Design a protein around this ligand. Sequence first.
Ligand SMILES: Cc1cccc(C(=O)NCC2(NC(=O)c3cccc4nocc34)CCCC2)c1
Ligand SMILES: Cc1cccc(C(=O)NCC2(NC(=O)c3cccc4nocc34)CCCC2)c1
Lengths: 242, 242
Amino acid sequence: GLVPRGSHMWIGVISLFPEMFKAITEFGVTGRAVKHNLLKVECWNPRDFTFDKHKTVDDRPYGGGPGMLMMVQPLRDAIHTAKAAAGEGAKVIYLSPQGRKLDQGGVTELAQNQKLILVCGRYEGIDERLIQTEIDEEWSIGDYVLTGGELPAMTLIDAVARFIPGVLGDGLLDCPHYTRPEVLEGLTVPPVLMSGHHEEIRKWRLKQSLQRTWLRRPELLEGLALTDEQRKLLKEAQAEHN
Amino acid sequence: GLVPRGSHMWIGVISLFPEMFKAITEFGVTGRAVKHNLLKVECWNPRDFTFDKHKTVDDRPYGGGPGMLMMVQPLRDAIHTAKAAAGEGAKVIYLSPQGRKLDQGGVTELAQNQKLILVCGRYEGIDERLIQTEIDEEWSIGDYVLTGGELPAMTLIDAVARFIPGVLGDGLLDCPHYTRPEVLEGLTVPPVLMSGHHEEIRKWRLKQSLQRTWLRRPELLEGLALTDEQRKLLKEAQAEHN
Ligand SMILES: Cc1cccc(C(=O)NCC2(NC(=O)c3cccc4nocc34)CCCC2)c1
Ligand SMILES: Cc1cccc(C(=O)NCC2(NC(=O)c3cccc4nocc34)CCCC2)c1
C-alpha cells in the first residue's frame, strides 16, 4: 500500500432511495475509489426506522396544504444511527435549496472532512427544527427546482472524491480541446497544437483558458491574484477580442 | 387517458455509463413518470460505436499531456444515431462546465422541448469542433469540478420532468417547514401554524418565504416584479429583521 491508513474517506448517506447511489459506487472514478477502498459510502433508509405497518416516511405540515414533508422520527433516527456508525468528527450536511451555494472553494472545504453524513430530502423537505438539532451545514448545488436531494448528494460526493489521496492517482475554465482527426468536417486543429512546439502550446492553452474564463465565467477570476504570465496573456486576449 | 398524446417527453442520452441512469428511471417522481409512459429515457453508449477490438472510447489531445479526451468517432456516431431515433425537432445539449448556468428560468426554457438529446462528457471532455458541428446548447449545473456529465444530466432531467403534463399530477425559497411533533427537543412550532387561522397562515408563509429569499438568495428577487402583498410583507420582514 502506497496510501497511508486513515486517509480514506467515509461518507454516510441518509436517503429514502439508497439504490440510487449505485450510480456513483459502481461506475467511473468514484466506482474505482470504492472498489479500491479509498472511498466508503454507507446508506441508511428512513423506511427502516419506522414502526407502523406501512412504513410511513412522510407527514403533513402544521398549517395544512398539499406540501408533504419527511416524517421527523424515521429521518431523525436514521441520522442518529449514522452518527453512531461514524463516531466523533462527522459533519452532518443537509442537501438543501436554501443552503450555501456549492462552488469549488466550498468543495475544497468539505473535502477536508474524513467523515461526512449527507441527508437527502424528499417531498417539500424536512422539519426546520431538525436543521437546528441535527444539521451542521446546508449546501446547494444550484438555483433550480428538483424532486430530491439524492442527485445533489451524489454530485457533492463526486466532487469531493477527487480530493481523496490515492485517487488520480485549477478550477478555471478549460481551454478548447482538440483530438483526432486533424480535420473534422472541414474544421482544422489550431496549427500550434500540431506544431510540436510545447512551450508555444503551453502559452496558448493558458491564454485560451483565461480568455474563456473571462468571457463565460468572469466571476471565477474575482477571487484570484493571477500570476504575471497569466495577467500578461489575459491582457493580450482581451485586446485581441475587442 | 386524461393526458393528450404527443405531450410525453422523450430524452435521448449519450453516455459511457448508461446504467447510471437507472437512478432516475427507476426511483421517485421520474421513475413513476417513466413507468406511466409520461417520460421516456433512451441511452446510447459510445462503446457500442467503436470498431477496434478493445472498444477504445478515449483519445489523446493534440499538443500532448495527461488530459485524455473522448474519442470523436464513437461519440459522434452515437449522437447521429440518437438524432435519427429522435427525428426532427430534437435539441442537442452538451452538459458542460463552460455552458450557460442552469437556473429555473433556464429549466423552463429546456422543458419546452418535447425532444432532448443529452451528451455526457467523461475525462477532460469532448473535441471543440464537435460542439460546433453537433451541439446546439451548452449547459452547466454549477461552478465546481466533476468527473462526468451524467450526474448533471440526471439533474437536468429531474428538473424538466416536473414540467411534463401528467406529472404531479414558484422558484422562491420555501418558508420554514414544520410537522409533528408540536415540541421537538424543546423547540416549538410557531403558534400561527397551530392556530387554524388559515388566512393568517397564508400571510405568514408568504412573508417567511420572501424574507428567507431576501436573506439567502437576494438575486432571485432581482428578476421579479413582486405583487403588492408581497412587497408589503417583504418590507415588514426587512424592517423587523433590522
Ligand atoms: C430553488 C428552490 C426553491 C424552493 C424549492 C426548491 C426545491 O427544489 N425543493 C425540492 C427539494 N430540492 C432539493 O433538495 C434541491 C433542489 C435544488 C438544488 C439542491 N441542492 O441540494 C438539494 C437541492 C427540497 C427537498 C426535497 C427536494 C428549489
Ligand atoms: C469549473 C470547471 C473547470 C474546468 C473543468 C471542470 C470539470 O469539472 N471538468 C470535468 C467534466 N465536468 C463536467 O462535465 C461538469 C462539471 C461541473 C458541472 C457540470 N454541469 O454539466 C457538466 C458539468 C468535463 C467533461 C467531463 C467531466 C470544471
